[PDB]
Amino acid sequence: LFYDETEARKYVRNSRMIDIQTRMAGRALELLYLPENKPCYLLDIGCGTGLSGSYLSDEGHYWVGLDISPAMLDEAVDREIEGDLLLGDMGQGIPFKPGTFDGCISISAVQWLCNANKKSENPAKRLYCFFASLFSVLVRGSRAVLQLYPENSEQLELITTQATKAGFSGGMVVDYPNSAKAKKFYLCLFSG
Amino acid sequence: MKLLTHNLLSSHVRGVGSRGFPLRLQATEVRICPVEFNPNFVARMIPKVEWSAFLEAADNLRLIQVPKGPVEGYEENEEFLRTMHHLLLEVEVIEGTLQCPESGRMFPISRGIPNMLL
Amino acid sequence: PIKLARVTKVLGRTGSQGQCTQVRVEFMDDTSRSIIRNVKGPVREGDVLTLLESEREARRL
RNA sequence: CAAAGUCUUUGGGUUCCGGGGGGAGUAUGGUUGCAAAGCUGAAACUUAAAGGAAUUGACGGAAGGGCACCACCAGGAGUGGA
RNA sequence: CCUACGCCGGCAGGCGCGGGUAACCCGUUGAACCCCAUUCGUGAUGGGGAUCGGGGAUUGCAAUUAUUCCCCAUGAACGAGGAAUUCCCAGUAAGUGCGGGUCAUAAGCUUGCGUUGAUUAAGUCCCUGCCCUUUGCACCGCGUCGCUACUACCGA
């Protein structure tokens, strides 16, 4: 466990956090060619307090948000969200029927799948379980864009390899890559 | 928890999966929350909805006011589309239960989040 | 069960940064069952640890 | 390599057979065979190399060591928030 | 030009009066935090003082785009900061002030000094780097049509 009520509140109320999360969500939406210029249904993965999910609502999207933290969800409740919030661990799978969502988005969250604290399956197993179920719950030709924070290049390669084995194709977009203070990795994928 | 979300949600048990949909629904509490009316979105939801599972979840929640199969059109019949908006988008479960009839497990929805953990 | 135990040595610093000090373990139940375990932090020769259990041991080979 | 020697200091007898590499053992014809295929066997054109022995230095996605808080761990102060 | 001392300025500053071309005179270089009492009492409040409106005094040819300093009034954001990241082994880091330096005034810049004084470990190659040693694109299962023109076949 990582967040509490105090820390979830301080994160969601910080103006600097709001601005950066909003910029990365809007960049993820620009990279999401499937919702870009289209209406869509969306899954927001690691939705937190709904800072990314509010910006999906701004473009007229209907969305479901998944997060593992109660306190992040409880803080989301008071923010007048239009999305459905669900308490859920993404590493156990995506619990929707095949072909439910046009797209999926995740901002600042999937690097937690490399962490082995919460559960006693390998991160490698949970990573496979995430990508294989994520491929299934997406429509055919659906898209997934994930902004994420990798600790090293091995973590990037492992994430890419698991997405590749699950049936995704696409690549990695690295914005501002000459500043390792401000650079951001976006995983940009599509299903078959 | 909008009613529509019922159609995109299933039991997380590895053995029930991929047969674990739909969950059977009971609501201890409900609310109507105002939402903007979009006929085009409702009509573009129809091709992503499992209609058989839609009727069953409505029946479980005490509603037979639903067409027998999926519908079609130019969106000019506001009657059926406004009734679909009212049901799918505007009725929210606050408190309730989600029972899978294959593993026997009952998951809760509480203010107003469905939880799919063991 | 709670098991207090004597420290005999410090074999090396196992781990990825030099962070698990390596300790041969006598028991304080006077039994000569000298299991070698791993600790985190400074231990000098002649200390005494609180092994939570004696079943789960450190890696041989 | 004891013959792959006695070969420009080039001749003991004698049979088959090779003339850059592809096109090609393809065509086409003859011939044998029940058949699959075997034997004999082109050319048009294309290309400046294909090949045979031996012989050395960079990259390792190759492995071992060794050092460093302009590395990590344990942590402090933080910056990045206004 | 460094100042002491005295006088006049509610506060910045003037006026008179020496030492000092320098361990001497400023200098015993009389500091800040710290401490002991007072008030406040957990909220945008007396925290934070930004952002400005009136003035006042110096520096100088020249202050208007506020030079700087002072005196009222104004009182925003900020509730311990996300991804990521810098520096850190004992008088160390960190709190905290004093002098040099471009120099007319100009000082959150830079360059030392002292005061208060910690946590943690004294290990390692995983991450980051750095130094040595050894070692050495053959191939297989991208296609559909259209009208016109041209080359080479078969040919009633």
From Swiss-Prot, chain A:
Annotated signal sequence range: none
Tissue: Widely expressed, with high levels in heart, skeletal muscle and kidney. Detected at high levels in bronchial brushings and in normal lung (at protein level). In fetal lung tissue, expressed in the developing bronchial lumen lining cells (at protein level). Tends to be down-regulated in lungs affected by inflammatory diseases or neoplasia (at protein level). Expressed in immune cells, including B and T lymphocytes and macrophages.
A biological-process GO annotation: chromatin organization
Keyword Metal-binding: no
Catalytic activity: a guanosine in 18S rRNA + S-adenosyl-L-methionine = an N(7)-methylguanosine in 18S rRNA + S-adenosyl-L-homocysteine
Induction (record text): Up-regulated in CD8+ T lymphocytes by treatment with anti-CD3 and in B lymphocytes by treatment with CD40 ligand and anti-B cell receptor antibody. In macrophages, no induction following LPS treatment. Down-regulated by a combined treatment with TNF and IFNG (at protein level).
UniProt GO cellular component terms: nucleolus; nucleoplasm; nucleus; perinuclear region of cytoplasm
Keywords (A to Z) from UniProt: Chromatin regulator, Cytoplasm, Methyltransferase, Nucleus, Phosphoprotein, Ribosome biogenesis, rRNA processing, S-adenosyl-L-methionine, Transcription, Transcription regulation, Transferase, Ubl conjugation, Williams-Beuren syndrome
Keyword S-adenosyl-L-methionine tagged: yes
GO terms of molecular function: methyltransferase activity; protein heterodimerization activity; RNA binding; rRNA (guanine) methyltransferase activity
Compartments, as annotated in UniProt: Nucleus; Nucleus, Nucleoplasm; Cytoplasm, Perinuclear region; Cytoplasm
Post-translational modification (record): May be ubiquitinated and targeted to degradation in response to pro-inflammatory cytokine signaling.
Enzyme Commission number: 2.1.1.-
Predominant cellular place of this UniProt entry's protein: nucleus
Subunit-level organization: Heterodimer with TRMT112; this heterodimerization is necessary for the metabolic stability and activity of the catalytic subunit BUD23. Interacts with GRIP1.
Name of the protein in question: 18S rRNA (guanine-N(7))-methyltransferase
Swiss-Prot record, chain B:
Organism superkingdom: Eukaryota
Keywords: Cytoplasm, Nucleus, Phosphoprotein, rRNA processing
Subcellular location(s) per record: Nucleus, Nucleoplasm; Cytoplasm, Perinuclear region
Result for mutant: I113F: Abolishes interaction with THUMPD2 and THUMPD3. Reduces interaction with N6AMT1, BUD23, TRMT11 and ALKBH8. Reduces expression of exogenous TRMT112. Increases interaction with METTL5
Molecular function (Gene Ontology), one example: protein methyltransferase activity
InterPro entries registered for this protein in UniProt: Trm112, Trm112-like
GO biological process, one term: maturation of SSU-rRNA
GO CC, one annotated term: protein-containing complex
Residue ranges constituting the TRM112 domain according to the UniProt record: 2-118
CDD domains the record matches: Trm112-like
Signal peptide span: none
Keyword rRNA processing part of the UniProt annotation: yes
Matching Gene3D superfamilies: 2.20.25.10
Role played: Acts as an activator of both rRNA/tRNA and protein methyltransferases. Together with methyltransferase BUD23, methylates the N(7) position of a guanine in 18S rRNA. The heterodimer with N6AMT1/HEMK2 catalyzes N5-methylation of ETF1 on 'Gln-185', using S-adenosyl L-methionine as methyl donor. The heterodimer with N6AMT1/HEMK2 also monomethylates 'Lys-12' of histone H4 (H4K12me1). The heterodimer with ALKBH8 catalyzes the methylation of 5-carboxymethyl uridine to 5-methylcarboxymethyl uridine at the wobble position of the anticodon loop in target tRNA species.
Subunit note: Part of the heterodimeric BUD23-TRM112 methyltransferase complex; this heterodimerization is necessary for the metabolic stability and activity of the catalytic subunit BUD23. Part of the heterodimeric N6AMT1-TRM112 methyltransferase complex; this heterodimerization is necessary for S-adenosyl-L-methionine-binding to N6AMT1/HEMK2. Part of the heterodimeric ALKBH8-TRM112 methyltransferase complex. Part of the heterodimeric METTL5-TRM112 methyltransferase complex; this heterodimerization is necessary for the stability of the catalytic subunit METTL5.
Family, per entry: Belongs to the TRM112 family.
Name used for this protein in its record: Multifunctional methyltransferase subunit TRM112-like protein
Source organism: Homo sapiens
Gene coding for it: TRMT112
Curated annotation (Swiss-Prot), chain C:
Predominant place of localization: cytoplasm
GO biological process terms, semicolon-separated: cytoplasmic translation; maturation of SSU-rRNA; ribosomal small subunit assembly; ribosomal small subunit biogenesis; ribosome biogenesis; rRNA processing; translation
Subcellular location: Cytoplasm, Cytosol; Cytoplasm; Rough endoplasmic reticulum; Nucleus, Nucleolus
GO MF terms, alphabetically ordered: RNA binding; structural constituent of ribosome
CDD domains listed in its UniProt record: S1_S28E
Modified residues (Phosphoserine): S34
Keyword Nucleus: yes
Keywords recorded for this protein, A-Z: Acetylation, Cytoplasm, Diamond-Blackfan anemia, Endoplasmic reticulum, Nucleus, Phosphoprotein, Ribonucleoprotein, Ribosomal protein
Transmembrane stretches, start-end: none
GO CC terms of this entry: cytoplasm; cytoplasmic side of rough endoplasmic reticulum membrane; cytosol; cytosolic small ribosomal subunit; extracellular exosome; nucleolus; nucleoplasm; ribosome
Disease: Diamond-Blackfan anemia 15, with mandibulofacial dysostosis: A form of Diamond-Blackfan anemia, a congenital non-regenerative hypoplastic anemia that usually presents early in infancy. Diamond-Blackfan anemia is characterized by a moderate to severe macrocytic anemia, erythroblastopenia, and an increased risk of malignancy. 30 to 40% of Diamond-Blackfan anemia patients present with short stature and congenital anomalies, the most frequent being craniofacial (Pierre-Robin syndrome and cleft palate), thumb and urogenital anomalies.
PANTHER family on file: 40S RIBOSOMAL PROTEIN S28, SMALL RIBOSOMAL SUBUNIT PROTEIN ES28
Subunit structure: Component of the 40S small ribosomal subunit. Part of the small subunit (SSU) processome, composed of more than 70 proteins and the RNA chaperone small nucleolar RNA (snoRNA) U3.
UniProt family annotation: Belongs to the eukaryotic ribosomal protein eS28 family.
Protein name: Small ribosomal subunit protein eS28
Source species of the chain: Homo sapiens
